[PDB]
Symmetry: T
Subunit: 160 residues, 12 copies
């Protein structure tokens, strides 16, 4: 009686611009995870262990995040690209340096990397929100989680 | 010194009748989706039976958690949900699920359509809900995200090349 | 040597009468679950919380039950119908009333609803047992579980 | 005052030789089903491999718990189970599982047939078991229910339309 | 619609005889639990640890059993009596001795008392089944579990 | 490559007004937690157990909430103050009474104080959302959870 | 071997007959409380049934753990517990629990009284127990604390302020 | 009914006003410590931030469990706790925690001092509490042991050897 | 740039001789599991319970082992045969005797059965290692686990 | 009396540059496999979508645990891993995963090929690794076993008859 | 700041050298017991091997937790534990455990004796420990209770009644 | 049938030299565990908490290791000696100092003693592998785990 009578009800399709905006988030989340592991392995020095552990927590969050974004793309029939060549070619994050790095350096480097990742999400936010408020909520989760990680990591170098 | 309020009776946020009706719309479609999800779960047969059988239960779990969330949000805001079978049948916007066994391919299309319809209800009421109460719109976002994920996980069986 | 040599050994098929008997159980278990949730949301008053919680436990049991019955039907190649229209059209349970209801009223209403559900199972029991003793065991589980729920709920209103 | 019994030696329920033999029949078919279930689990290939691979392990787990239940029920009732490979091979009623790889479609039919055969043994001994010991028949009901569920979950892959 | 009319649908209630039969099972399960704990504490000698542990498993099973029976009585409008005076005065189990007892003696004593408990259940079974098959299924679980315990305990003393 | 150049990419920092708004939410969440525990310990009378338990769930939620807000302040370079003197001097919640209180009185008192807490969050919401939508999502979780608690608590005193 | 004792047989701390007697007093009242708690758990009816039904089981769990603790502490100290039904009935200090269904109000009063009697036993033996073995007194403190908490959680139902 | 008491009303152990006062002293300092611990948890910055951030939460968890333990022990003994913000601020013996971000070195020293003040309160009331109720003294021992462990785990950061 | 350009890269194929060597391990692991259960059911006498329990742990290990070996065969495109007829026809283990057996006898019998199973693994070891060192590691796990079980079981009969 | 060593500085095992390079080779292929595994996980569509979607995540989990193991083994032995995106892309031996959606059948072949390639790298460096450090070769064996199992579980979808 | 102390540095409770010495005595015997327990765990042979093998590990678990508890209690009170092998061997009061395989009967007697020696140490220092710090005496009570339980569970094997 | 004839199939037994080699590993693992606990309790100073925690993880690993080796000895008919006098008299580890020690000193000391322990295992490895490859796999696990611990501990003191 209130039942719709069409047999093919279509779902919400993301525009290609929307898809491209999420793609920007995706490559930076993947880059951050790869850099996070690099730092996790190669960090040395005063308070090694805390940083080693916190960096894995960052990587866990970024990996869950990239999965969330890529699957949101798929849900809206966009198609993610998380391949190494694409990530390296299109990430906005400054390159992580080679070799062992002191804990103090890793703190500063990773804080910058996180901040760059958050900047990407904040940059695409309003365009994403305008087309799909539900996706913007996922972006909010990422902003909150990553900014927490930035605070947890950077506080090591804070002098008061 | 003190910023303490003096009132002994402080009231909670009360939903408008329109707001209540909008959440009721979401509720009946979520319950209907749960019932149809179980029907499909029992009655699907054919190529890749098991995957769909399993995925349908995850859909049902999500839709059930969703309807409890919406109904309780109604209660929180002094609205009164109606999830009785007669009301659900008489007021759901979902096309009826067909009777008896259905092929995996058919169940995929059928259930995808019914998730799409459920999501459409939530998207239709979204702006009016968000305008009155942003906190409730957030619950709607969770439902939209979770259901559209289910739709992707189910529908992809039938997507070719 | 004791191995059977037929390549197609058929399983036990339920008669359509058997299927129909389980269908009767199924719609009442589903109706009970829907009514149980209605009560769980709309119950108000003295000892709200206990009833709110106990009603969810009832719903959990009834939902597990309806799954058990519908899957037993499928196991024996019967075909369940748990659709809203069928449930509303064929349930034997008295309708649950609209609106907020006091805990005392909900206690009496739900006890009656449970008792109606058990009555259906007891009514079909002997016919089910005659064709398939293994299914009757599932009915026994339902009778025991539901009658426990009736006692747990009704005891609230018992005056001694 | 006191209803206490005075006997220092109170005996337990002892199964008849016929009862023991009937449970032995159930036992060998359950073990054989477990062995064939694993064979199929390793050797299935083709369309929807993974689902069947996984479902077969659940079948094996159930059949294994079942054979331990039956064997221990025998022990409880002063009967002596024989689950040795030679006895199982020489006395099982199940058709032999074929050797080497088998297609998903073939494994579905083959295993469904072997579950049906296992259940048939339990159904054949049921009335004689129930007559002597209703508590043991209840264990049989659990096996019948659990195995017929497995048969449905496996066979539905091959059921069309 | 097939909806029933009644507002006060009543549940199945047990006969006095039925309640009395469940009461008999109840006192013997409670007695067995108390005797099980006595044995658990006071057993000494060869293979103490195994028997000490197994006896706790027996107790767990008997306590779950007593609760099951007593709650089934409640569901069916019967009233259990599990009080110490009642258990002592009405149990059919041979008295368990005081003081330390050898493992071999404990095996024999507890096996006898388990068998006594199973005997009570087997004695009331047919009258219980005839009135309410659902309750008889609970009895079957008890017979099965306790007879398993008898086997696990008595096997210690078996020769060849 | 799309890689950014900067070596010291900074994170989003909150305005003084924003930090002040989160501080307001923080003191009321801490106050509510302290009042929740007071009520939890000192409630007596009809349906004591339900209220005793529910109040602990309220406290759990409020404590998780306070930590969330305070850590969001830290992430955004604001500085929380959750000290007892500050909470007492700046909380907007009506004072909770000392001494034993009836269940009915506790229901009314705590419902009022939950509502006061939600009011603070709702009052700052638009200013918070305008500056940082990601933080507003945290506020939504709080509004949703606390308003759920108000419903679960107040329903005890509802008549018909 | 600088500080090593060279004794082949080093004996354990042994409880006096008085100490054993004192723990036996605690043991029977803990067992009686457990049995009465279950009686109440089953037969309680009326306003706030569920809360009381549930709390009474928590009481029983605690009293059962307590009795096992005391009995095994006796065993550790070469004393011999007697937790048999006849002994418990003949020697408990707890007032008898009445038969039949009892209202929640009545059960609250009854059970509070019986908990308080149990705590009184432990409090009565405490100083003698502490004088001989402080480690056992600590076990009593656990019991006192746990049981008085139970009494508060149960009795608060009947409080009018 | 051989040893059974026949009293209808058996009353529980009641704390004296002095005893209630003594537990109240412990309660406010435990609550103040929890609030200061969280303040420190949030605002600590600098070398070894994470270890301290994490340890401070463990301190808070312990102090929160402790305050609930003491308050409910008061309830059990018919005393009435007051854990309200005004009462805690007006009656705590703990030195005030400073505002703003503080270095890890400073936080270590500050928090060690505040833990030590809390332990001092418990140590000050211990003998009076033990004299009236040994079971409550045991709860104090738990608190002393747990808090002094926290002090060691925190202060060791600033140790130079 | 270092990327291989072939679209079909083949994996490592086991030789049929390798497959046959693992098949030898497989049938003995299955036979051991079947014999282990036989012993687990039929063991009686002094220290029954310990043996009953330890025998199930042996069976668990042997079942996990046979799954590991059969799946390693499949991974390398060999094809296992764990059918009852094949196991009975090709196992190297001495037959387990019928009927109840004393704990002392079961200890000696099962120790021999385990030792025979380990001997098979040790016999094929060097041929397996020569073709695939990764498979030999799985054999090492089996040798270590089974030899542990032999020690745990046999120690019961050791007189010193 | 004493077998104690006297050195205050005892060095750990240090890998040769060649050993480090060999583990680096394994590392980049494991990371590349993880990235391609996720790509396939998101982008697979068609017959038996769900099974492959799920199995691919298990592959990714294994490859991720593997790369952390190898990288940390490098660190343990004074070698320095490079898992950055540029290095992985520039030095992986895996054929590139294609862009956009791919059918289940194609994903099966593609991913199987890429696992085979990853395993080939480990098998190629194996003997040189084992010669210098047998303990590291054991870690390689785990990877070989786990990946070849994944290859079987994925590839069997496409294997016929 | 009404009741707030204004001291910048509030120091913790410090153990006397006698108290530290007393805990050190308990510590070495707990460590020795753990090492002897493992020796017995490994080398026990004969009738009822498994029960003893398993019980001995539970003993070791308890003794290891106990030693950590005592050592960290020392740390909390500004005392310094020494749990090094040389110190333990030179200062333990436990009779030496013999080398080689030992029968279950012998192990029961040996280990009971060694547990009893350990408990004796704790019992010997108890009053001095309690006099200075009642909170530490409670930790001793835990140890006494736990170890005497272990002695009962082990020694009961060799009892003939 | 391929069934073997023997009734008393014996297991692999280790040479005196092999048992002696495992004994060497055993005493150094026990010593390391005792030294690990000493360090765990007595470390003070900068980054205390991290080192305190990590040292417990080292101890856990070494204790699991000692049990593994001692039980492998038992499986192979060797007899472990883990007694305090034997460990003290035969351990190759440099003595750990008494008294409080700084974090930096503890890092250096424990790293040296871990390396000493790994050295023992590496010294006996080839003789162990030649006799029994299955035991050498257990040695590999130990080398891998301990060398991981050395890295996690020593990195604290690494400069740049
Ligand atoms: Cl699956
Ligand atoms: Cl509750
Ligand atoms: Cl940490
Ligand atoms: Cl055991
Ligand atoms: Fe929003
Ligand atoms: Fe939002
Ligand atoms: Fe029946
Ligand atoms: Fe039945
Ligand atoms: Fe049953
Ligand atoms: Fe949200
Ligand atoms: Fe104490
Ligand atoms: Fe090797
Ligand atoms: Fe190896
Ligand atoms: Fe004391
Ligand atoms: Fe204590
Ligand atoms: Fe290995
Ligand atoms: Fe995923
Ligand atoms: Fe709910
Ligand atoms: Fe289901
Ligand atoms: Fe079993
Ligand atoms: Fe119960
Ligand atoms: Fe936090
Ligand atoms: Fe016990
Ligand atoms: Fe509490
Ligand atoms: Fe498997
Ligand atoms: Fe890692
Ligand atoms: Fe520790
Ligand atoms: Fe062990
Ligand atoms: Mg209530
Ligand atoms: Mg640190
Ligand atoms: Mg599939
Ligand atoms: Mg034993």
């Amino acid at each position: 009686s209130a039942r719709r009578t069409e047999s093919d009800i279509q779902g919400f399709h993301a525009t290609p611009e929307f898809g491209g905006n999420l793609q920007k988030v995706l490559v930076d989340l993947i880059e951050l995870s790869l850099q996070g592991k690099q730092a996790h392995w190669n960090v040395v020095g005063s308070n090694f262990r805390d940083l080693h552990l916190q960096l894995d927590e960052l990587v866990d969050f970024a990996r869950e995040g990239s999965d969330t974004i890529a699957e949101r793309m798929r849900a809206l029939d966009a198609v993610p690209d998380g391949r190494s060549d694409t990530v390296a070619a299109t990430t906005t994050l400054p390159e992580f340096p080679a070799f062992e790095r002191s804990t103090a350096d890793v703190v500063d480097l990773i804080t910058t990397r996180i901040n760059a990742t958050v900047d990407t999400i904040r940059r695409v936010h309003d365009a994403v929100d305008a087309e799909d408020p539900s996706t913007a909520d996922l972006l909010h989760g990422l902003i909150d989680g990553l900014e927490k990680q930035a605070w947890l990591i950077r506080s090591e170098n804070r002098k008061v």
